[PDB]
Design an enzyme around this catalytic site. Structure first.
Site, PDB file in Angstrom:
ATOM      1  N   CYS C 152       2.139  -2.285   8.923  1.00  0.00           N
ATOM      2  CA  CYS C 152       2.293  -3.369   7.993  1.00  0.00           C
ATOM      3  C   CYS C 152       0.936  -3.951   7.670  1.00  0.00           C
ATOM      4  O   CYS C 152       0.684  -4.299   6.529  1.00  0.00           O
ATOM      5  CB  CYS C 152       3.195  -4.408   8.578  1.00  0.00           C
ATOM      6  SG  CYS C 152       3.029  -4.416  10.336  1.00  0.00           S
ATOM      7  N   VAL C 156      -0.271  -4.889   3.897  1.00  0.00           N
ATOM      8  CA  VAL C 156      -0.484  -6.247   3.407  1.00  0.00           C
ATOM      9  C   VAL C 156      -1.864  -6.377   2.772  1.00  0.00           C
ATOM     10  O   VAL C 156      -2.023  -6.992   1.711  1.00  0.00           O
ATOM     11  CB  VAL C 156      -0.284  -7.270   4.538  1.00  0.00           C
ATOM     12  CG1 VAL C 156      -0.585  -8.670   4.037  1.00  0.00           C
ATOM     13  CG2 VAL C 156       1.137  -7.200   5.069  1.00  0.00           C
TER      14      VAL C 156
END
Ligand code: ICS
Ligand code: CLF
Ligand SMILES: [Ca+2]
Ligand SMILES: [Ca+2]
Lengths: 477, 522, 522
Positions: C152, C156
Site C-alpha cells: 500500500c 499511496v
C-alpha cells in the site's frame, strides 16, 4: 404387469438353472392371488437351499444367538467353538439396551471359548467349565450364562448340558446350553425354535412357585420385539399411555428377570410371530395366558392394533386408547401431508427375513407406495397365508430368492425402491435403484409406533428422492 | 412426540422426558437392576491393577477377540483372481457372515457361494452337496474358476475335497478341464490370515505343480508379488504404481482391487479385473517372488522355494521408511532397474513431513493391535517417528514374531517400555490401558468401546482411538487409504499428527479455564 | 514444580493449584476485572438475535476478516514461475508477514524480497531503492526473472514501477533483456485473489504483448490452464494427471507445486520447477485457454480474449460431479481427444461413494466461507450431495457472484434456506451460527475460535469446524489434499461424512446415558 407377463418372466429367469434346480425353484416362485387362502397351493417354503446358488439365508446360530438370546443384556452369552461365528455376529444387530457395558450389561461383547485344534481332538468339556469359572471371577454382576453351540460342538460330541447343570448347581447361577449348531437347520428359523425351547426349559419356569409379584389386570408382555433402533421402546410407551403395564420385553432391552416374570401377566402381545410363536403357544398351553399379534408399522396398523388390544380389556382401557389415538392423530397426519405427495405412486420390492416383508406393507400403503413384490428368507406357510391377504393382485412372491433370481426380477420389473439386507444393498445401488436396509433400518429409526412413522417417511423420502440417482449415466455417453 | 419439521431419530428422541420416565419405570419395576453404587464400585474395580492380574490369568475364556476364521481370508484370496467364485464347502451361515463382514468393511458387493450343508450332510458327508453346488454355481453365475474353501464343519467331519471334486468331474457335473482349486482351511487353526495363505498355496499348487518341467526361472523377466491378506485398495494401487514408476515388470498375484472397487454406472459386475489364469501358469517363469507380508505367507514361501525354485528374498513389509527403502533396493537388485528420481523425491518429501511434525509425535505413547505384519510395520514406523508403543498386541501371533518384534524394539531407545503380547484379546488391552494409560490407540473399529470405557472413568483417563486396520465399520471409505510404501507412511503420519492436534484442541477449548493454550498456529 | 519423568508443557502445567492461586490473586488484586456475572450476561446478550441485528448494522468496523491483501496473491503467483524471485516494492514488514503466513500454511520455505522502503522513501520516492533492490536480488539470489509487486505504501505515494524499471535497465543496474514483469497491487482494493490476477496479467502482458504478430492460434496443439490462487498442491497434481490421462497437451501457466513441496534430502533449493518463460511466450499459440477459477480472473480473461484472441470457455471451477463433467467435456471438445475409460471409472467410483454415504449427508446444515470460486464449487457439491447450506459467506465477493450463487441455489430444492452474504466478516458469521445454528462450519483455521464460543454457551450449541480452505494453521500437511476434480470430490465427501460420524460418536459416548446409539456399524 399382468399374471401372464410375470409368469413369462419367471420362466425366463428359471431357464438358466439346471433341471433339478429349475424344478426346485419353480415351486418357490408364484404370482399373488388374494382370493387364495391356502398358500401351500401356490408356494412351498421352509425347504433346504439349493447348493451353490448364493442364497441369503443364515444359520441356526444366527437365529438363536444373533436374534433371540443376544438382546438379553444381564446375561453373558458364550459362543462355544471357534472364533469366527462369535466375531462376525458381535454388535452387528442394532438391538438397543440400557446398561453399563462390561459391568451389568453384555450385549455388545464377544464371549467365546476360542477352540484350537487341541480342543477338537480332546474335546472341550473341561475348557467350558474353566471358562465358566473365569466368567464368574471377572464378571460378578452377570445374572446368567448362555452357552450357544457353534458347528464343531455337535460334531465332536461335546456334552454341554451336563456342564451347565453341574456348574449351575455349584455356582447357583442359571446356565442355559443352546444347541444352535449352524448345520441343524436350513435357516435362522430353527434357531428361533431352539432358542425358544432353551428359554422354556431353563429360564421360564424358575418362578412357577413364586407369588410375591403384585399382578394387575392390566399386565401385558411384549413378545417378539427386539428393540431394533429403539423400536420396542416406541411401542412400550404407546402401551403405557393406555394404562397397560408392560411387565416384560422379549427380548430387546430385556433382562432375565422379565422373562421369569412373564408368566405372571394377563396377555402376550406378539410382534414377530415367526420367532416367538413357539413360546407364546407354550405359555398359552401351560399358564393359560392368551396371546395376540399386533402390528405397529404405520398409523393405520398402529390404530387397528391399539383398538384390538383395548378391546381385549375393559372400558377404561378403551377410553385411554381413544385418547391416545386422538392425541397422536395430528402428528402422523402432518407427516402424511408432507411426505405422501413426494412418495405417491412409487413401486417397492421387498425381501426381508420372516416378518417384515408383510408388516411394513401397511406403512408403504399409508404413503401411497405400492408393493409390487415381497418375499421372505425363512418364512413358513403360515407366514405366506398371512401375506397373501396383504399383497395386491398380480404381485410377485418369492421364497429364498437367489442373487440371480432377485437381480433378474428387479431388472425386469424396475421398482422405484428396494428393501432388503446388507448383502444386496450395493448390488442394487450400482444399478441406479434406491435401496433401504429393512433389517437394521439403515442405521436409523425407530420405525414402530407413531413416533417411528415420521422417521420412516423421512428416510423413504430422503432415499428415493436423493439427487444422487440422476448422475449414474455419464453425460458424455 | 415427533414434529414434522424437526424429526428425531433414536438419538436424541429417547432423551425426552416421557421416554426417560418410561425407561426409569421399567428399570425400577421389572429389570431388578443392581444399585448404581454397586455398579460404580465394580466398574472402578475393573480399572484397578488387581483386576488386571486376574484378567491376564485367563486360560479358557476369550473376551472381544481380535481375529477371524481362516475361510474369510480364503474367500478374499479367491476373490483376488479373475472370474473366480469363492465356494465354501460347509454350512451356509459362514458365507452369510463373511459377506456381511466384507460388505460392512468395503461397502461393495461380495460374491460367495456355499453348499448349504445340513444335518444329513453331517451324517453322510457332503459329496452330493459338492456336486450339486459345483454344477449350479457353474451354470448360474458362469465363473471361469471355482475356488473351494472349507468351514469347520467340513474339517471336523473330515470331508476329502480332492476326492469329492474328482468324483464330481468324472460324473459329468462339471467339465474335466474346468479349474477347481481347493484348500483346507480349518477355522480352529490360526486366523483369517492363515486362510489366505492356504488358499493361495492351493491355487498355486493346482496351477503349477503338474507343469514344472518346462519352467525356467527368469523366462518372462518379471517379478511376482504376493500381497497377502490386504484390506486397503490403496496398498494394492501403490504397490503397482511404485513398480510402474520403477520400470519393473511385475505380476500381481491375487489382485482384488478391481472387484472390490467397481463404478456405479447402472450395471452390476459380479467379476472385474483379477489375476488371470495365464499369469498363474506363467508365475514359475518369473525372476523371483516377493511376499509383501512374510509372517502369514510361510506355507506359500515353502511352496515357492521348494517347487518354483525361486529364492524368495527375506524382506519386511514395506511399511515405514527403512523397510520401504529395503524393499525398493531389493527390487532394484532383482530386476536390475535403477531406482528412478520420482521415488527419491517422494522419500525426501516423506522425510520433510517427518521433520516438520516431530515436535508433536515425540514421546507419545501408543497401544496398538492387529495382524502380525501390519503390527510390526506400524511399530517400526512409530519407532522411526520417536513415539513409544507401550502396549503391543497381536491375537493371531506366534512366539517367533514376538521375538522379531522384541529384536526390533531393542534396536531403538524408544522401544524401552514396550511390551509385546500374543494370544491376548481386547479385554487384556482394556485392562492394560486402564492401568498403564497410553496417549492413543491404533486399531480397528472394535477398539471404540474400550475408549468408551476409558471416558466413563473420567475425561482425564480417556484414550482416543485412531482407526488403522481391519475391520473399520463406523467410518466411511477408509478402505481406500494406503499403508504400504512412502504414500502410506505419509497418510499414517498425517493421521497420527492430526489426531494428536485434534485431541489437544479438544482438551484446550474451555473458555477462561484452559483456552489460553488454544493457539491458532499449532 | 515439574517432575523430571513427566514434564508438562504450558498445558496442563498452568492448571496446577499453585498456578491457579497465583492467577486468582493477580485477577483479584490489580486487574479490576468485571464481575463474572456481568461477563456471563454480556456473553449471553452477544449470543442473541438482538446482538445480531446490531452486528449487521456495522458500516466501518470489521472484526475478524476472512481475506488478505493483493501482494500476498501476487507473491504466490510469482512463485509459480521458473526461477522467479517474488520482489515486492514497498516496506519490508509486508514481505515478512507474507513469508510467515505462507510458511505457517505450507510448512515450506518461501522466498520473497523487499526493497525496504522507509520514511526517506516516503518523500523522495522509490527509484534508488528499486535500482539497488533489483541489483542486489540479481547478484545474491540469482534468478532468471523478477516479478515486481507493490504494497500500500508504494501505491499511496503513487510510484511509477514501469518508469522505475526502465530507468534501472537504462542506468546500468540490470541487463536490458532480463525479464522484469510488474503489476500494481494496491492492498486497499480487492483481496489476495485480485493480487494474483493482477500479477498473472502483468506477467502475461510482459511476455506476450509485443510479439503477437507471429502468433497463430492453435499452432502448437496445446491448451493453456490458469489455476488462479490455489493453496492445495493436490489440485495442481490432479489437473495435470487428468489432462495427461485424456492425452491432451497442456501448459500450466502457474505451477508452484514443485517449489512448495521440495524434498528434504540435505540440500536447500530456492527454486524448483515452475512454468518456463518459453511456455509463456508460446501461450498465444495454444488451441485455447481454460481458467480454473473464472471469478477472480476477470483481468486475465480480458487480456486473453482481447490480445491472445483465445475464446475462453465459460466453465465453472471443476469442483463436484457436474462441473467436473462439464470441464472434461469442454476440454475434449477443444482438443478433440476422447474421454478415456479411466475417468469414467473414477466418476463411477465417486458416484458409488455418493450413493453409499447419502444417508448421513442428507439434511445436514453447513455454514461455509472462503474464496468466491471455492465457495461456489463447495456449495454446488453440497447441493449435489443433498446437504443444505444455510450461511454462505464470502468477504471478498461481489454482487455478480452473489447473483450467480443465488441462481445456483434456486435451481435445487436444498438451497431453500441458504442465504448468501458478500462483505461480511467472521463476527457476522458468529452471530449467524449462534442464532441460526447449523450442523457444521466449513472453512479455514479462523473459525476454530467460533467453535470455542459456541461451546461456551453449551455443548448442545457447539458447531464443529471442518478445515477446508486457506489458511490452515492448526493442522499439519492438509495443504497436500485435493479439492478439484473427481479425486478432490472423493476426499471432500470422505472428510464430511467422517466428520459427521465422529460428531455422532462423540455425542453418544456417555455410558448408560446416551451410549445406546453407540453403534459399531454406521
Ligand atoms: S426376529 Fe427375525 S431377518 Fe422376527 S430373524 Fe431377522 S429383528 Fe428380519 S424380518 Mo434381520 S423374523 Fe426380527 C428379523 Fe424378522 S434379524 Fe430381524 S430384520 S422381525
Ligand atoms: S454355520 Fe464360524 S464363521 Fe464358519 S468357518 Fe467356523 S468359525 Fe468361521 Fe453358524 S455356527 Fe458358525 S456361523 Fe458358520 S462356523 Fe457354523
Ligand atoms: Ca459402494
Ligand atoms: Ca516441509
Amino acid at each position: 404387469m399382468s399374471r401372464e407377463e410375470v409368469e413369462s418372466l419367471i420362466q425366463e429367469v428359471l431357464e438358466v438353472y439346471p433341471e433339478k434346480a429349475r424344478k426346485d425353484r419353480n415351486k418357490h416362485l408364484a404370482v399373488n392371488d388374494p382370493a387364495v387362502t391356502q398358500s401351500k397351493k401356490c408356494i412351498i417354503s421352509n425347504k433346504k437351499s439349493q447348493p451353490g446358488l448364493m442364497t441369503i439365508r443364515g444359520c441356526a446360530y444366527a437365529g438363536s444367538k444373533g436374534v433371540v438370546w443376544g438382546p438379553i443384556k444381564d446375561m453373558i452369552h458364550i459362543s462355544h467353538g471357534p472364533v469366527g461365528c462369535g466375531q462376525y455376529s458381535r454388535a452387528g444387530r442394532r438391538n438397543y439396551y440400557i446398561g453399563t457395558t462390561g459391568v451389568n450389561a453384555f450385549v455388545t461383547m464377544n464371549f467365546t471359548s476360542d477352540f484350537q485344534e487341541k480342543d477338537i481332538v480332546f474335546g472341550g468339556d473341561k475348557k467350558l467349565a474353566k471358562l465358566i469359572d473365569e466368567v464368574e471371577t471377572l464378571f460378578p454382576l452377570n445374572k446368567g450364562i448362555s452357552v450357544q453351540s457353534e458347528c464343531p460342538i455337535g460334531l465332536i460330541g461335546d456334552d454341554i448340558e451336563s456342564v451347565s447343570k453341574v456348574k449351575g448347581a455349584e455356582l447357583s447361577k442359571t446356565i442355559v446350553p443352546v444347541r444352535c449348531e449352524g448345520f441343524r437347520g436350513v435357516s435362522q428359523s430353527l434357531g428361533h425354535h431352539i432358542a425358544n425351547d432353551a428359554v422354556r426349559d431353563w429360564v421360564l419356569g424358575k418362578r412357577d412357585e413364586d407369588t410375591t409379584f403384585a399382578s394387575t389386570p392390566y399386565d401385558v408382555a411384549i413378545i417378539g420385539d427386539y428393540n431394533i433402533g429403539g423400536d420396542a421402546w416406541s411401542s412400550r410407551i404407546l402401551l403405557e399411555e393406555m394404562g397397560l403395564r408392560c411387565v416384560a420385553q422379549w427380548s430387546g432391552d430385556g433382562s432375565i428377570s422379565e422373562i421369569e416374570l412373564t408368566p405372571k401377566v394377563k396377555l402376550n402381545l406378539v410382534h414377530c410371530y415367526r420367532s416367538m410363536n413357539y413360546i407364546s403357544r407354550h405359555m398359552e398351553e401351560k399358564y393359560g395366558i392368551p396371546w395376540m399379534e399386533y402390528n405397529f408399522f404405520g398409523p393405520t396398523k398402529t390404530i387397528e392394533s391399539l383398538r384390538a388390544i383395548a378391546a381385549k380389556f375393559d372400558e377404561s382401557i378403551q377410553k385411554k386408547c381413544e385418547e391416545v389415538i386422538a392425541k397422536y392423530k395430528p402428528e402422523w397426519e402432518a407427516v402424511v401431508a408432507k411426505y405422501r405427495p413426494r412418495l405417491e405412486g412409487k413401486r417397492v420390492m421387498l425381501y426381508i427375513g420372516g416378518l417384515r416383508p408383510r408388516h411394513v406393507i401397511g406403512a408403504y400403503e399409508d404413503l401411497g407406495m405400492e408393493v409390487v413384490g415381497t418375499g421372505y428368507e425363512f418364512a413358513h406357510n403360515d407366514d405366506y397365508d398371512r401375506t397373501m391377504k396383504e399383497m395386491g393382485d398380480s404381485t410377485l412372491l418369492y421364497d429364498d430368492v437367489t442373487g440371480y433370481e432377485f437381480e433378474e426380477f428387479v431388472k425386469r420389473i424396475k421398482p422405484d425402491l428396494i428393501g432388503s439386507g446388507i448383502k444386496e444393498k450395493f448390488i442394487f445401488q450400482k444399478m441406479g435403484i434406491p435401496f433401504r436396509e429393512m433389517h437394521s433400518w439403515d442405521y436409523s429409526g425407530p420405525y414402530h409406533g407413531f413416533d417411528g412413522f415420521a422417521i420412516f417417511a423421512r428416510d423413504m423420502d430422503m432415499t428415493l428422492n436423493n439427487p444422487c440417482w440422476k448422475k449414474l449415466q455419464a453425460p458424455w455417453e | 412426540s415427533q414434529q414434522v419439521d424437526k424429526i428425531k431419530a433414536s438419538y436424541p428422541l429417547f432423551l425426552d422426558q416421557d421416554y426417560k420416565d418410561m425407561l426409569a419405570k421399567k428399570r425400577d419395576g421389572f429389570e431388578e437392576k443392581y444399585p448404581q453404587d454397586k455398579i460404580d464400585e465394580v466398574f472402578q474395580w475393573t480399572t484397578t491393577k488387581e483386576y488386571q492380574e486376574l484378567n491376564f490369568q485367563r486360560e479358557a475364556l476369550t473376551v472381544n477377540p481380535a481375529k477371524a476364521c481362516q475361510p474369510l481370508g480364503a474367500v478374499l484370496c479367491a476373490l483376488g483372481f479373475e472370474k473366480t467364485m469363492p465356494y465354501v464347502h460347509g454350512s451356509q451361515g459362514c458365507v452369510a457372515y463373511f459377506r456381511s463382514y466384507f460388505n460392512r468393511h468395503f461397502r461393495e458387493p461380495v460374491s460367495c457361494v456355499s453348499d448349504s450343508m445340513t444335518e444329513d450332510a453331517a451324517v453322510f458327508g457332503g459329496q452330493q452337496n459338492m456336486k450339486d453346488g459345483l454344477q449350479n454355481c457353474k451354470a448360474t453365475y458362469k465363473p471361469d474358476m471355482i475356488a473351494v474353501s472349507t468351514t469347520c464343519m467340513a474339517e471336523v467331519i473330515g470331508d476329502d475335497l480332492n476326492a469329492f471334486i474328482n468324483n464330481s468331474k468324472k460324473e459329468g457335473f462339471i467339465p474335466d478341464e474346468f479349474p477347481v482349486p481347493f484348500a483346507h482351511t480349518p477355522s480352529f487353526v490360526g486366523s483369517h490370515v492363515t486362510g489366505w495363505d492356504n488358499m493361495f498355496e492351493g491355487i498355486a499348487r493346482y496351477f503349477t505343480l503338474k507343469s514344472m518341467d518346462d519352467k525356467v526361472v527368469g523366462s518372462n523377466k518379471k517379478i511376482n508379488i504376493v500381497p497377502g491378506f490386504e484390506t486397503y485398495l490403496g496398498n494394492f494401487r501403490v504397490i503397482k504404481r511404485m513398480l510402474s514408476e520403477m520400470g519393473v515388470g511385475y505380476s500381481l498375484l491375487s489382485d482384488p482391487e478391481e472387484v472390490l472397487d467397481t463404478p456405479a454406472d447402472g450395471q452390476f459386475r459380479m467379476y472385474a479385473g483379477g489375476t488371470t489364469q495365464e499369469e498363474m501358469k506363467d508365475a514359475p517363469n518369473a525372476l523371483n517372488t516377493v511376499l509383501l507380508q512374510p509372517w502369514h505367507l510361510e506355507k506359500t514361501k515353502k511352496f515357492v522355494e521348494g517347487t518354483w525354485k525361486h529364492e524368495v528374498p527375506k524382506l519386511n513389509i514395506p511399511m515405514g521408511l527403512d523397510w520401504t527403502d529395503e524393499f525398493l533396493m531389493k527390487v532394484s537388485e532383482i530386476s536390475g532397474q535403477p531406482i528412478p528420481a520420482s521415488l527419491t523425491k517422494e522419500r525426501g518429501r516423506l522425510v520433510d513431513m517427518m521433520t516438520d511434525s516431530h515436535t508433536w509425535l515425540h514421546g507419545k505413547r501408543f497401544a496398538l493391535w492387529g495382524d502380525p505384519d501390519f503390527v510390526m510395520g506400524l511399530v517400526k514406523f512409530l519407532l522411526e517417528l520417536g513415539c513409544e508403543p507401550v502396549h503391543i498386541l497381536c491375537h493371531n501371533g506366534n512366539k517367533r514374531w514376538k521375538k522379531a518384534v522384541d529384536a526390533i524394539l531393542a534396536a531403538s531407545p524408544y522401544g524401552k517400555n514396550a511390551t509385546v503380547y500374543i494370544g491376548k484379546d481386547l479385554w487384556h488391552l482394556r485392562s492394560l490401558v486402564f492401568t498403564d494409560k497410553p496417549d492413543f490407540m491404533i486399531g480397528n473399529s472394535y477398539g471404540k468401546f474400550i475408549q468408551r470405557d476409558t471416558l466413563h472413568k473420567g475425561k482425564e483417563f480417556e484414550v482416543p482411538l485412531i482407526r488403522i486396520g481391519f475391520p473399520i465399520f463406523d467410518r466411511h471409505h477408509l478402505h481406500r487409504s494406503t499403508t504400504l510404501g512412502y504414500e502410506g507412511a505419509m497418510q499414517i503420519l498425517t493421521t497420527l499428527v492430526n489426531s494428536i492436534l485434534e485431541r489437544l484442541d479438544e482438551e484446550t477449548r474451555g473458555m477462561q479455564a484452559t483456552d489460553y493454550n488454544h493457539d491458532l498456529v499449532r
